[PDB]
Every structure is written in C-alpha cells, then in structure tokens.
Write a protein that binds this ligand. Structure first.
Ligand SMILES: COc1ccc(-c2c(-c3cc(C(C)C)c(O)cc3O)noc2NC(=O)C2CC2)cc1
Length: 207
C-alpha cells in the first residue's frame, strides 16, 4: 500500500467541501455520473478506430448499487478506466488548475453546484461520503484501488477484489446522516432531475 499527500490546493478543495454549510448535497451523484459518461465517451471514440479496445467488454453502461448493510453507494461504469499514473495524478483530472478556477469563480458569486464546470466534480463525493474508494482498470494497466478519507492523504494499492474487465467503480462510504442516498426513490428522483439525458443506460440495482 502506497500513501501519498494531496497537493495543497486539492486538500484545500476537500476541506472546503467537507466543512462548508451547503444543503444541496445531491449534486454529487450528477457529478459522478457525468464523469462516468465522459469515460464512456472516450472508450466509445477510441473503439471507433480500434474495436479491439472493447475486448475487455463491449457494453457501455452505468450501474448504481446501494447497499444499506455496508452503508455504501457504488457507481460502476465500463468506460475507459484509469491507469495507476492517472489515479496518482488526481484521478485523471486537472485538479490544481481546476481548483484555482473554481475557488475564485466562487468569489465571483458562484456556488458549489458549479463544481463540474472546473473539472473537479469528483471531489463533491465528500459532501456525502466519509471515505471514497475508487477501483479502476484501463486496458493498458492493472486493476488498482485508490482510497481517501480526506485529511490530506490518499492510498493506492493493487486491487485484490473482483476483476472489472474495464472501467471505474466509485464506492461512497456514506456519512451516518446521509443514508437517504441509499433509498431507491431518492436515487431515482436525483437521476431524473439531473441526469435525464445521459447517453448510456443507467441501471439502479435494488436490494
Ligand atoms: C472530469 O474529469 C474526469 C472524468 C473522468 C475520468 C476518467 C474515469 C472516471 C473518473 C472518475 C472520478 C474518480 C474522477 C469517475 O467518477 C468515473 C470515471 O469513469 N475513468 O477514466 C477516465 N479518464 C478520462 O480520460 C476521461 C474521459 C474523461 C477522469 C477525469
């Protein structure tokens, strides 16, 4: 297991997300679904010229998996996936510059819900989760698990769990007071409100 420090700007972004009073927490799901859609777009485009990139799985979809027993909400996609290098480099995001652009878009009146416009929507996960695990598999690398409970550090390790084929799984270990996001009707409501026109099948698993 390797432990890394977040860049100062990202730790600041996470501290802001965790500590700022902001009731509209449901946007985290929109942001994660958007990321999955972006990753799915990428493997789709690459497969147009090289269909063998789909040997790791032809289906392009997003699954939402609540587990009330574990208090986890998991978002799984079969997009392009991330390499180990991507994970360490802020999960394939432009997080340093994006955080800068977000930080003082906020000072120009913006609110937290615009976070995705600055490429760092992922970190909105910390509105609802005390810990986030990101398990990912890119065609060119092995399957890795990234994890952080904030506090300035993250870990990366080779994943031992179920083979994913290709794509990304974001596991949200929910805060005690945020269990509404495990309820079927709440999830459906949020998907219909914010993600109605995502161009990939979104399947909400039941328990
Ligand atoms: C908005 O920033 C993003 C969005 C998606 C990704 C991404 C992902 C990916 C990343 C995340 C976050 C953990 C950041 C996610 O929730 C879902 C995903 O499928 N897998 O491969 C990728 N690699 C990519 O190059 C792609 C298409 C965007 C990385 C950065």
């Amino acid at each position: 297991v390797e432990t890394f420090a977040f860049q100062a700007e990202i730790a600041q972004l996470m501290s802001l997300i965790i500590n700022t009073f902001y009731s509209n927490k449901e946007i985290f799901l929109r942001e994660l679904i958007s990321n999955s859609s972006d990753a799915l777009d990428k493997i789709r485009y690459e497969s147009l010229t090289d269909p063998s990139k789909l040997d790791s799985g032809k289906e392009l979809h997003i699954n939402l998996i609540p587990n009330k027993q574990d208090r986890t909400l998991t978002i799984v996609d079969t997009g392009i996936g991330m390499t180990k290098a991507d994970l360490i480099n802020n999960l394939g995001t432009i997080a340093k510059s994006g955080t800068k652009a977000f930080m003082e878009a906020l000072q120009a009146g913006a609110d937290i819900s615009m976070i995705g416009q600055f490429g760092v929507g992922f970190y909105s996960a910390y509105l609802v989760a005390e810990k986030v695990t990101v398990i990912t598999k890119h065609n060119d690398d092995e399957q890795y698990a990234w994890e952080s409970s904030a506090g300035g550090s993250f870990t990366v390790r080779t994943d031992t769990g179920e083979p994913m084929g290709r794509g990304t799984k974001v596991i949200l270990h929910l805060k005690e007071d945020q269990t509404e996001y495990l309820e079927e009707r709440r999830i459906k409501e949020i998907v219909k409100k914010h993600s109605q026109f995502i161009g990939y099948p979104i399947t909400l698993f039941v328990e």
